[PDB]
Amino acid sequence: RSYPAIPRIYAETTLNMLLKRAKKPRVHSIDEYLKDGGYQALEKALNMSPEEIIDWVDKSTLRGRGGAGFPTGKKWKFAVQNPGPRYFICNADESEPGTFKDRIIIERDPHLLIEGIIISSYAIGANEAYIYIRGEYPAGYYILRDAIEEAKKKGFLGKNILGSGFDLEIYVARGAGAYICGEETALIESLEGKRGHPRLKPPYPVQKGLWGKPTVVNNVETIANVPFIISMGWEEYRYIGPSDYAGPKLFPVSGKVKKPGVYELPMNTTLREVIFKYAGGTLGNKKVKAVFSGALDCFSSEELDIPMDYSPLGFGGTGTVIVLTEEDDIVEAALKIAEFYEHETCGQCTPCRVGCYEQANLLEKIYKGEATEQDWEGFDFVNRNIQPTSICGLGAVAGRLIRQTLEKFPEEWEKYR
Amino acid sequence: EFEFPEELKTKLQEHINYFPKKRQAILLCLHEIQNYYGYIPPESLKPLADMLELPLNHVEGVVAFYDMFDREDKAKYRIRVCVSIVCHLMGTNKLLKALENILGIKPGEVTPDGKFKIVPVQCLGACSEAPVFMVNDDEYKFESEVQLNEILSRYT
Ligand SMILES: Cc1cc2c(cc1C)N(C[C@H](O)[C@H](O)[C@H](O)COP(=O)(O)O)c1[nH]c(=O)[nH]c(=O)c1N2
Ligand code: SF4
Ligand code: FES
Ligand code: NA
Ligand code: NA
Ligand code: NA
Ligand code: NA
Ligand code: NA
């Protein structure tokens, strides 16, 4: 059928796994997916025990691709030590600035995701799974609904899938404008028909999630690895990239590069290589000033030789690379990050609520040259005081990138005082 | 007395039957309502609550929480313009100026015919194609005013 218009984001791969089809900017339907051997991993998985599948995913070393890098197999193990029923949730809320990696899987190769969801659900004994997709991805929503119908037609969903005795339905829910609904407990609240308010953790979803039952939440990109692990086996999968951070990774690259888009690369790739070897260098061949890891971290031009992995000295996050060059005002950029957190705090926690607002409000004054001395001192204080009492990760990091700009670019901030 | 036109009620009922529990369909129903009316009519919220078997104040709270929903302004087409970091870097202001030249409105406003409303939004997840906007469900990179004018001409 006809889907809404989607911009044709450039995609490029050195590994030909997650982007084997999604490197082409069009919907790949089930016949094309099947032609590439699709759903044979599911068939293989259904001839294994859930425990075996968990074991393979564990030994693959797959870590969460939604930002925190939690080991996926271990998450599944935690869930299954708890009595059922259990639920499986695919987090497709992708709303962090700079981050557009998950959508190209959803919109171009939906069956890769769906196959991943079916295998994962079987692994943890979930008979009901959800995709929670942000409201601003309407095309992705329609594409997934249609793809799920295809899978049903071919007998990959429903009751007694391929004679295995395993039953599964996948429900597609839509968000409606809140970044915080990507936080897994706020996501669950939203699926339950409520406001997206994060819950105190622990308990983690794997102990108490949707309707209080064991629930696994995993990111789109995480789930899209699962068919490869089963198809290749965990040993072959672990042979991809460095053995301590194995597997393909998607890197969404934006800002002042010549070839902005999504790159599928091993995680031993350096930030400098992502920018200059793959993304074609900078616009105008201007010097790199900074890279924003979404709205999380700010790296200076002195930090470009770090690996794009989940190590202490590595890039981390979701591998989101926003490039700023020498003429980009860092304070103007910091204001945009402050505005994001201001717009997205859910307000449950007082320092988060007032801190996200005040941080943006005072930084706007600073930027426009209308800040008093008290406003300057207040901005500094507020930036350091968003985290206290916070119950989720947003309050923990709303000041993080901005603080790093204050530390790494003092001269520029000084100009504004 | 406020009643949903049958063709809307039908779609609402589909969503409500879709998930295992009725109340999980709340956001899909609200999307559908906004699609039909060009906004969320305050009067619609009571009947929706009844169909979801939720209290009215629960529904009101949900509409208030989620930024995609709009109870103020009826608009046939919502031009969602990303005002986040990458689009700002790559030319959000050029796009706003172009929209102002074609339509005669700024962010937050509706054209006098009720046809277009400009809605400033956070990162739309298309940052490589910055600066990014949506016209209802359709999404585009802004290239120039002449290009934008051609795009907008398709919405009648
Ligand atoms: C404020 C905020 C917002 C988000 C998140 C966290 C927080 C604190 N997380 C992470 C999420 O809670 C969770 O860690 C992952 O979904 C777990 O999946 P993986 O283990 O990464 O596969 C998250 N994850 C994701 O997959 N998509 C998203 O858009 C977001 N958004
Ligand atoms: S830290 Fe902020 S976003 Fe997270 S629950 Fe508290 S108020 Fe909401
Ligand atoms: S910053 Fe505009 S689409 Fe991401
Ligand atoms: Na088990
Ligand atoms: Na992140
Ligand atoms: Na069907
Ligand atoms: Na959302
Ligand atoms: Na928003």
A347 conformational bin, left if phi > 0, alpha if psi -120 to 50, beta if neither: left
Nearest C-alpha neighbor of A6 from the set A145, A96, A137? A137
Q: Which of B83, B123, B129, B142 to mutate to test the pocket of ligand 3 (most atoms within 8 A of CB)?
A: B123
> What backbone torsions phi and psi does residue B132 show, to the nearest 5 degrees?
-110, 140
* Residue A150 per-residue DSSP state: H
Q: Which two tokens stand for residue A242?
A: 């460095």
Question: Which residues lie closer than 8 Å to A125 by C-beta, 6 or more apart?
Answer: A50, A80, A84, A85, A86
Say whether both A85 and A207 belong to one domain.
yes
> Chain B residue closest to A142 (CA)?
B137
C-beta of residue A166 within 8 angstroms of C-beta of residue A160: yes
Say whether both A227 and A82 belong to one domain.
yes
Q: Which helix (H) or strand (E) holds A403?
A: helix A400-408
Q: Which two tokens stand for residue A222?
A: 């995480």
Q: Which of residues 68-87 of B touch A (CB under 8 A)?
A: 68-69, 80, 83-86
Helix pair angle (B26-37, B45-52), 10° resolution: 150
Tokens 């209308």 sit at which residue?
A370
In A96-248, which ranges are continuous DSSP H helix?
101-108, 110-124, 138-153, 184-191, 220-232, 234-238
Chain A hits for B139, CB-CB cut-off 8 Å, are: 4-7, 139
From the list B24, B88, B140, the residue facing A191 with the nearest CB is B24
Q: Which of A328, A357, A389 is the last residue of a domain?
A: A328
Q: What is the edge-to-edge ordering of all strands in the sheet holding A261-266?
A: A10-13, A261-266, A248-255, A321-325, A288-293, A297-300
Say whether both A319 and A358 belong to one domain.
no
C-beta of residue B111 within 8 angstroms of C-beta of residue B100: no
Chain B hits for A98, CB-CB cut-off 8 Å, are: 85-86, 123, 127
Say whether both A84 and A194 belong to one domain.
yes
Q: What is the DSSP string of A278-325?
A: IS-SBGGGPPEEEEEETTTEEEEGGGTTSBSSSSTTS--TT--EEEEE
Nearest C-alpha neighbor of B64 from the set B108, B30, B35, B32? B30
The domain that contains A230 carries what CATH number? 3.40.50.11540
Q: Which domain holds residue A259?
A: 240-328
Say whether both A163 and A128 belong to one domain.
yes
Say whether both A252 and A297 belong to one domain.
yes
Say whether both A104 and A161 belong to one domain.
yes
Point out which residues pair with B77 in neighbouring strands: B116
Our count of domains for chain A comes to 4
Say whether both A348 and A234 belong to one domain.
no
Chain-centroid distance, C-alpha B145:
23
Say whether both A33 and A103 belong to one domain.
no
Nearest C-alpha neighbor of A54 from the set A84, A82, A74? A74
Say whether both A77 and A182 belong to one domain.
yes
Q: How far apart are CA A115 and CA A151, in angstroms?
A: 9
Say whether both A235 and A135 belong to one domain.
yes
First to last CA, chain B: 32
Q: How far apart are CA A9 and CA B128, in angstroms?
A: 7
Q: How far apart are CA B125 and CA A294, in angstroms?
A: 11
Say whether both A317 and A277 belong to one domain.
yes
C-beta of residue A391 within 8 angstroms of C-beta of residue A341: no
Method: X-ray
Work out the angle at residue A246's Cα, subtended by the Cα atoms of residues A82 and A147, and round it to the nearest 5 degrees. 65
Residue A214 identity (one-letter amino acid): P
Nearest C-alpha neighbor of A57 from the set A172, A224, A211? A224
Point out which residues pair with B132 in neighbouring strands: B141
Q: How far apart are CA A285 and CA B62, in angstroms?
A: 48
Q: Is A184 in the pocket of ligand 1 (CB under 6 A)?
A: yes
Q: Radius of gyration of chain A from Cα atoms?
A: 22
Nearest C-alpha neighbor of B63 from the set B46, B76, B80? B46
Helix, strand, coil percentages (3-state) for chain A, rounded to 5, are 45, 15, 40
C-beta of residue A318 within 8 angstroms of C-beta of residue A102: no
